[PDB]
Amino acid sequence: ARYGATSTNPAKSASARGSYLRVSFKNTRETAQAINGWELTKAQKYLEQVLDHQRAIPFRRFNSSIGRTAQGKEFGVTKARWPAKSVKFVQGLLQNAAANAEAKGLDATKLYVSHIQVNQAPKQRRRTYRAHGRINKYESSPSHIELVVTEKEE
Amino acid sequence: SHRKYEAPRHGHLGFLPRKRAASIRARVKAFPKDDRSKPVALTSFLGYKAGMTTIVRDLDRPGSKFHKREVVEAVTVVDTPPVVVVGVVGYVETPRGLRSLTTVWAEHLSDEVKRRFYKNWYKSKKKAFTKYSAKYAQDGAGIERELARIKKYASVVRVLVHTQIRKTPLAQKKAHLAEIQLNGGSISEKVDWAREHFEKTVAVDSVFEQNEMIDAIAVTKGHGFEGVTHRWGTKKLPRKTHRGLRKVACIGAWHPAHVMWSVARAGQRGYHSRTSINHKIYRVGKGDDEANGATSFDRTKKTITPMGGFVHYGEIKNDFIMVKGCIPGNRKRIVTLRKSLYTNTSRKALEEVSLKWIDTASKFGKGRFQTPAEKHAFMGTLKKDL
RNA sequence: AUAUUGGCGAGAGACCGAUAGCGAACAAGUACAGUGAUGGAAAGAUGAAAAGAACUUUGAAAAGAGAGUGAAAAAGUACGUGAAAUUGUUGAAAGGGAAGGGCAUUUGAUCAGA
RNA sequence: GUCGAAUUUGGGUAUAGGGGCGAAAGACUAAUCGAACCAUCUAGUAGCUGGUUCCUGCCGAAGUUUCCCUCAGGAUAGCAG
RNA sequence: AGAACUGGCGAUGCGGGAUGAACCGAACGUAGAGUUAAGGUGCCGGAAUACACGCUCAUCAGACACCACAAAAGGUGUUAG
RNA sequence: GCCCUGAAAAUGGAUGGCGCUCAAGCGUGUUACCUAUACUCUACCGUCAGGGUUGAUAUGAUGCCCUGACGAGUAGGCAGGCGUGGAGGUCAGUGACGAAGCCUAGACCGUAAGGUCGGGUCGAACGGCCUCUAGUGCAGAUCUUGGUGGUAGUAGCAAAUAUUCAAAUGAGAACUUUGAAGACUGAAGUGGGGAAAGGUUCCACGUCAACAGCAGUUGGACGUGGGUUAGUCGAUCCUAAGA
RNA sequence: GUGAACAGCCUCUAGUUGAUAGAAUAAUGUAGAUAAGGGAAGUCGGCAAAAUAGAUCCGUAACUUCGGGAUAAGGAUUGGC
RNA sequence: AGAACUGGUACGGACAAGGGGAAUCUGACUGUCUAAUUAAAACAUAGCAUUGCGAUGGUCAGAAAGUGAUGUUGACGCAAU
RNA sequence: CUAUCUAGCGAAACCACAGCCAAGGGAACGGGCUUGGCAGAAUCAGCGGGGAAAGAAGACCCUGUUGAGCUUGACUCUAGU
RNA sequence: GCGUUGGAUUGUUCACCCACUAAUAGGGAACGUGAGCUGGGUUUAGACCGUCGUGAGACAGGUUAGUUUUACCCUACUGAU
RNA sequence: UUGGCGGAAAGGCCUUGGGUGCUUGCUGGCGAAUUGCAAUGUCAUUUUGCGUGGGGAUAAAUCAUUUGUAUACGACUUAGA
Numbered sequence A: 001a002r003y004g005a006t007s008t009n010p011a012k013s014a015s016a017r018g019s020y021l022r023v024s025f026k027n028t029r030e031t032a033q034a035i036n037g038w039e040l041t042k043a044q045k046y047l048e049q050v051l052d053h054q055r056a057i058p059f060r061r062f063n064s065s066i067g068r069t070a071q072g073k074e075f076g077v078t079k080a081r082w083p084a085k086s087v088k089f090v091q092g093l094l095q096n097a098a099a100n101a102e103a104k105g106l107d108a109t110k111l112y113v114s115h116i117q118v119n120q121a122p123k124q125r126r127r128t129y130r131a132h133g134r135i136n137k138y139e140s141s142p143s144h145i146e147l148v149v150t151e152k153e154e
Numbered sequence B: 001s002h003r004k005y006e007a008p009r010h011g012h013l014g015f016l017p018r019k020r021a022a023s024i025r026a027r028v029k030a031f032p033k034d035d036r037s038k039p040v041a042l043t044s045f046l047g048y049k050a051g052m053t054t055i056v057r058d059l060d061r062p063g064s065k066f067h068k069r070e071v072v073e074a075v076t077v078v079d080t081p082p083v084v085v086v087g088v089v090g091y092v093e094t095p096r097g098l099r100s101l102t103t104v105w106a107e108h109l110s111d112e113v114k115r116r117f118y119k120n121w122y123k124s125k126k127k128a129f130t131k132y133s134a135k136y137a138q139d140g141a142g143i144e145r146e147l148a149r150i151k152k153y154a155s156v157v158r159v160l161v162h163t164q165i166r167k168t169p170l171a172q173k174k175a176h177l178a179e180i181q182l183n184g185g186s187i188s189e190k191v192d193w194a195r196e197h198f199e200k201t202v203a204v205d206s207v208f209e210q211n212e213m214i215d216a217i218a219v220t221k222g223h224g225f226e227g228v229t230h231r232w233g234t235k236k237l238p239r240k241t242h243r244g245l246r247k248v249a250c251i252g253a254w255h256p257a258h259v260m261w262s263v264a265r266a267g268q269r270g271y272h273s274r275t276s277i278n279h280k281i282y283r284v285g286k287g288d289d290e291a292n293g294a295t296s297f298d299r300t301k302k303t304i305t306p307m308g309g310f311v312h313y314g315e316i317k318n319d320f321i322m323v324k325g326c327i328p329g330n331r332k333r334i335v336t337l338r339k340s341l342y343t344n345t346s347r348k349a350l351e352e353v354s355l356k357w358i359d360t361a362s363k364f365g366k367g368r369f370q371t372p373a374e375k376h377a378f379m380g381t382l383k384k385d386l
Numbered sequence C: 001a002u003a004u005u006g007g008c009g010a011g012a013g014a015c016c017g018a019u020a021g022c023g024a025a026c027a028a029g030u031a032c033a034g035u036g037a038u039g040g041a042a043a044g045a046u047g048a049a050a051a052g053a054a055c056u057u058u059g060a061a062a063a064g065a066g067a068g069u070g071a072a073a074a075a076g077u078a079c080g081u082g083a084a085a086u087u088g089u090u091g092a093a094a095g096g097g098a099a100g101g102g103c104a105u106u107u108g109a110u111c112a113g114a
Numbered sequence D: 001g002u003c004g005a006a007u008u009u010g011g012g013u014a015u016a017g018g019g020g021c022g023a024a025a026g027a028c029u030a031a032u033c034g035a036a037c038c039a040u041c042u043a044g045u046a047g048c049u050g051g052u053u054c055c056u057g058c059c060g061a062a063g064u065u066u067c068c069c070u071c072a073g074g075a076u077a078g079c080a081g
Numbered sequence E: 001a002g003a004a005c006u007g008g009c010g011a012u013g014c015g016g017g018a019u020g021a022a023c024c025g026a027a028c029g030u031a032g033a034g035u036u037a038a039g040g041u042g043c044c045g046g047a048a049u050a051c052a053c054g055c056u057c058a059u060c061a062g063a064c065a066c067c068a069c070a071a072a073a074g075g076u077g078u079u080a081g
Numbered sequence F: 001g002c003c004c005u006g007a008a009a010a011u012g013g014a015u016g017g018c019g020c021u022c023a024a025g026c027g028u029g030u031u032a033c034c035u036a037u038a039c040u041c042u043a044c045c046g047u048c049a050g051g052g053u054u055g056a057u058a059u060g061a062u063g064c065c066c067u068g069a070c071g072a073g074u075a076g077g078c079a080g081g082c083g084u085g086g087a088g089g090u091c092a093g094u095g096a097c098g099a100a101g102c103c104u105a106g107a108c109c110g111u112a113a114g115g116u117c118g119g120g121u122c123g124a125a126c127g128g129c130c131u132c133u134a135g136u137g138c139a140g141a142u143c144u145u146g147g148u149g150g151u152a153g154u155a156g157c158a159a160a161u162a163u164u165c166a167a168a169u170g171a172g173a174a175c176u177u178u179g180a181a182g183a184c185u186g187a188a189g190u191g192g193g194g195a196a197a198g199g200u201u202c203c204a205c206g207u208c209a210a211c212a213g214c215a216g217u218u219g220g221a222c223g224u225g226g227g228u229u230a231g232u233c234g235a236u237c238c239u240a241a242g243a
Numbered sequence G: 001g002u003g004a005a006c007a008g009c010c011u012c013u014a015g016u017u018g019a020u021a022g023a024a025u026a027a028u029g030u031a032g033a034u035a036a037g038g039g040a041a042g043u044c045g046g047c048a049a050a051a052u053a054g055a056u057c058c059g060u061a062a063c064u065u066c067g068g069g070a071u072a073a074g075g076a077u078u079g080g081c
Numbered sequence H: 001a002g003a004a005c006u007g008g009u010a011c012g013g014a015c016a017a018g019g020g021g022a023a024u025c026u027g028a029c030u031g032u033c034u035a036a037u038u039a040a041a042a043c044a045u046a047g048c049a050u051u052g053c054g055a056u057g058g059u060c061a062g063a064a065a066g067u068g069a070u071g072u073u074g075a076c077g078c079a080a081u
Numbered sequence I: 001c002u003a004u005c006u007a008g009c010g011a012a013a014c015c016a017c018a019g020c021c022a023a024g025g026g027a028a029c030g031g032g033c034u035u036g037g038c039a040g041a042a043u044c045a046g047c048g049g050g051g052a053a054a055g056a057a058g059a060c061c062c063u064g065u066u067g068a069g070c071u072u073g074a075c076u077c078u079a080g081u
Numbered sequence J: 001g002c003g004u005u006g007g008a009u010u011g012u013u014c015a016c017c018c019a020c021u022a023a024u025a026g027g028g029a030a031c032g033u034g035a036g037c038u039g040g041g042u043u044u045a046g047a048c049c050g051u052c053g054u055g056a057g058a059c060a061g062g063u064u065a066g067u068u069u070u071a072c073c074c075u076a077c078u079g080a081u
Numbered sequence K: 001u002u003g004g005c006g007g008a009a010a011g012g013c014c015u016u017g018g019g020u021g022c023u024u025g026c027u028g029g030c031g032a033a034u035u036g037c038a039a040u041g042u043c044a045u046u047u048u049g050c051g052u053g054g055g056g057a058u059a060a061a062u063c064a065u066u067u068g069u070a071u072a073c074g075a076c077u078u079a080g081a
């Protein structure tokens, strides 16, 4: 429990989280922001299309010197990617949230991603060897991912 | 300190930036000065560069070492089917330049030109100009009112013409639409000519004539990102050079503490708009005219098409303009041929050229025969046929 | 009678309170490095009590959502509290080649005193 | 370059720091050599470089005299509290 | 580069000299009002496109000391002796 | 006198800029006007000085009050204060009905060091005053230790010819296994054994949190076990340089 | 097997198929190459590269310590049957 | 070793594999060194020459020794250049 | 084969704050200050003008009453003889 | 505005000569330009010679050999969204 | 409502006829107060949203696929009911 700041009704919402997931934090942040606020089924279809390279995840903050693609145009950006590992983790948490909403008795057809946040887990440390007998860090940037889907209402 | 040895700078600073042209059809940025006593006529034409061949002609140049002798010259063939007039644009002069006041279109537009207004033609409803065609409902009152405005104003008149790209061997299938200034004064009758030619074709022979010096406006062949050595013609650095030698060694002095615009840098090469002038028309050939590639000395009944077809283009089945030399742009590219902006009387112009022979051998190799009949005559009977 | 940074047994302190105090509050002269002489760390705290999360559900699983234990899970062994740098989300605001600041007031938000 | 003898090389063994060893470069002597490494003397000395942690109030300089193995320092008088 | 007297900067902000350690003015607790210094009053920019007598036309005019340069020699240019 | 010639330097640029020609230029004169932390007056703060006031209810005579003048400041000196760890006394101080700590573009007080309060979090001690004491205040020291960024999802993971198809397993297969194919080491091997060294890496089963700079169901990994059989092979014995 | 050959190249037994991959084919690179005519004019300097190359036969100068120089130089031939 | 025949005159057809000549300076040569910027003309070398010494000795070690290297040696030797 | 784009993986140097110019003055070569020119999000591949770019408390020079290697009838000694 | 060269010698700037040419003008830009190159010279350590010095060593005296590191950041520029 | 003129950015100017409201050109009748002695004492136009009625119309672009006149990636150029 104790997710990030939310403003939705806990009785109309369902939560899902994953901690210390060995997936890139920056890629997963971009993936989460790509579906923040989307309807659940639309977001899942979009993630499947991202995995199929039919649509892309726009990279807005962590995008320096990444590359350009025509698939960022629908988001009004030139820089977009297809972070498959992040997408897979996100859709796993999305299906977990959908299962929790079904167990809570929420209407799956009104579910939208009312909250999704990715922050940095503790780094997993490895070593890389460099010229002239030097050693540098080779750490991972794992993620804590949390999301809550809420029934759309008025 | 000084350069320590003088040399001219590499490249022309008047052709900057060396960027991609904004459009594949190079813009006509200047039309011939209007002579308002002449009949109304087009000042340019649209064609497609088909390819190059070579010709033989008797040089008429008194005082030259080759006077009254045979010379072999390279020529470029531009396939120029007649262009269809589909509109007229009126241009009023303003303290801020020329300004289009209104455009009057033809009632019926072919699918060739309608495709130009669509990015996705196959899945569109083809609604373009469907409400505009209703302006011609009973008497065309709105059309006549707009034409009357063009007559009452619009000191400069241009017609909208489009190519018949379906008559070319190109797969593009989407016509090229361009504005051509109407020279021949009485703006009233400029508009009258445009309206009377609405939906009608204009043949290249009504614009251009034999021996006339014309200008070719086209986007050059693109070559992508290029280094300084070929983009600008700078000296190759010695073999000993660390970090590469296809570079410019000094891209600037310490001060100004900036790379200057005049220093050669790596970047895009080609796909630039170029207006090259003074290309003499060697032939105004007609599409329906069999023996197109024949002359009064050759008499071999052959078309202008080389054996096996123009490489990467196809066969010439339409009217064509054969100009001396080469013109910017590659084969299949739209090129605008425009009348010269001045009167050339240098005895290079005003020369009347008479072709003696036109090469129709294959450009797909070391072509040996001008015609299949000549190939049969030389080779005899083969096993497969002939 | 005098000395005593060793050994053994005691009593104390206006001393230090885990980067301090012996290097070592803990399997510390340990792990580890060096051929060797030698060099030599880091590392304390759930909770009164494991009562350390039965059971259900999603997932291949890790885990999640519940349920539950507990005074508290804003104590879940990655455990007392839980700063800052740095980061995510939400909310607010501003943004023509920095940002930040001083005086003054407009506007928005917020608030004390009477 | 050299490649059948002043050849290359394993193992054993000997030579240890102002010492060894050197077909000699101050070369090599465990990534250390115009004096190895380790610990201690040792928190070595430094007129030289860097830093030197709260507020407010009042007063408020000197780069000048003489002497010094003195000239990037000090003593002395002067200025200041 | 080295001396003499004084005033300063260092140690000093403030108004002016666009800008500047030293120049000009003036030295400073926190505020209000008035008046000024040096400097300015076409606009930037607060303040007269004020008043008055003349001089200058520059195909490199000139426009406030320190200060950011100009000389000898010349000109029926023009003005006054 | 003004103007002009004399009068040539390097990025494009400087009466400060624009611009200005009976000037907005030059020389001169007269007024009006603008504004400094300067002058004048007043208020407040502090400092210094000179005084008045123990005649009581006057508990603050280092107190209260009156008067005048003054206020720049590095190095530096002095004074009055703020804050921290611990100590003696005291407030029979605060506190599990919540101490300390922390967060808080919420409030109050002080010129300030700082102090106080509200709210949230939290869980066991802590504070005011009079004094004592010091390992007592950090922005720097290429400061020490630890942690964390931008760079940046960037540089890059390109030597050693080269991989491909299907099936099985598996949640997941470019990388595991099998089969088929294509290749290489080409006997001075990428083969088969050993010496030094390592020490279980050998083998089997289970198994993938970490490691194998991609992956992984695989492994020299992880977990549990099994395995090294000598009169004849070595050591042991001999002596060598030497110890 | 070719070949003088433990050279280079291909193959047999044995072993491996292990190097992060996929898609494109810009500049500039790293490595490998070619180039008309000229032939060191480049450059400090032929650096780099090219040219020559095995074997058989012919022929081989100055100088010389008589041993060499020497594969001097310079030429011809090479397959298959 | 020779002959005939034969072919796009190719043929050490891949692989493999000297460029050569005329001279100057320098070191005779083979060899050796600055491991990690200097391979050389530097060092060494054979050859030549000088020096000391007949053991109660020459040269050189050791703090000292009833100690030691040359020396299991003896001038055709050892030691120092 | 890179570079490029993608999936996975994923550092380091450096970093007062940062990053458009011209002139001025200024510690006499400004990214900031003054006066002008100007100035429109977010970016990709290259590039080597600039950041008096980074790498190192300049190795050159000087100073220090700071050393060390080496030399010599420097001063003062000393093993040996 | 436009051009101002090809070479022999020298590391050379400079110089000189050959030659073509319309001409072979002078200069600046951190004596422009080394994260552009190169490293011939100078200017570390090796070595030789001459002179000097008793010597270690000295020599704008000559000679030979002697590692030229990093851009992925910002701007500027070139192109591209 | 009749008609004309105006294209430099016209988007406005002029004009015909009738209807209709006001008319302070002149003469009257009624009302105003207490906003308390002032407090802009709210009278304008800029966009947007929403609801109620009426009028009008019934598409494209991009991704994906494809082309190569293009290209590092974007982009460009093509084709596809």
Ligand SMILES: [K+]
Residues within 6 Å of the ligand: D034, I068, I069
């Ligand atoms: K030394």
Ligand SMILES: [Mg+2]
Residues within 6 Å of the ligand: A064, A065
């Ligand atoms: Mg970028």
Ligand SMILES: [Mg+2]
Residues within 6 Å of the ligand: A065
């Ligand atoms: Mg890149």
Ligand SMILES: [Mg+2]
Residues within 6 Å of the ligand: A128, A129, A130, A131
């Ligand atoms: Mg490495």
Ligand SMILES: [Mg+2]
Residues within 6 Å of the ligand: A132, A133
């Ligand atoms: Mg190593």
Ligand SMILES: [Mg+2]
Residues within 6 Å of the ligand: B002, B003, B004, B005, B006
């Ligand atoms: Mg020049």
Ligand SMILES: [Mg+2]
Residues within 6 Å of the ligand: none
């Ligand atoms: Mg060309």
Ligand SMILES: [Mg+2]
Residues within 6 Å of the ligand: B240, B241, B242
């Ligand atoms: Mg090189």
Ligand SMILES: [Mg+2]
Residues within 6 Å of the ligand: B311, B362, B363, B364, B365
């Ligand atoms: Mg051809």
Ligand SMILES: [Mg+2]
Residues within 6 Å of the ligand: none
């Ligand atoms: Mg400790």
Ligand SMILES: [Mg+2]
Residues within 6 Å of the ligand: C045
């Ligand atoms: Mg703890």
Ligand SMILES: [Mg+2]
Residues within 6 Å of the ligand: C072
């Ligand atoms: Mg609690």
Ligand SMILES: [Mg+2]
Residues within 6 Å of the ligand: none
């Ligand atoms: Mg933690």
Ligand SMILES: [Mg+2]
Residues within 6 Å of the ligand: C082
């Ligand atoms: Mg905690």
Ligand SMILES: [Mg+2]
Residues within 6 Å of the ligand: none
């Ligand atoms: Mg924080």
Ligand SMILES: [Mg+2]
Residues within 6 Å of the ligand: none
């Ligand atoms: Mg910008």
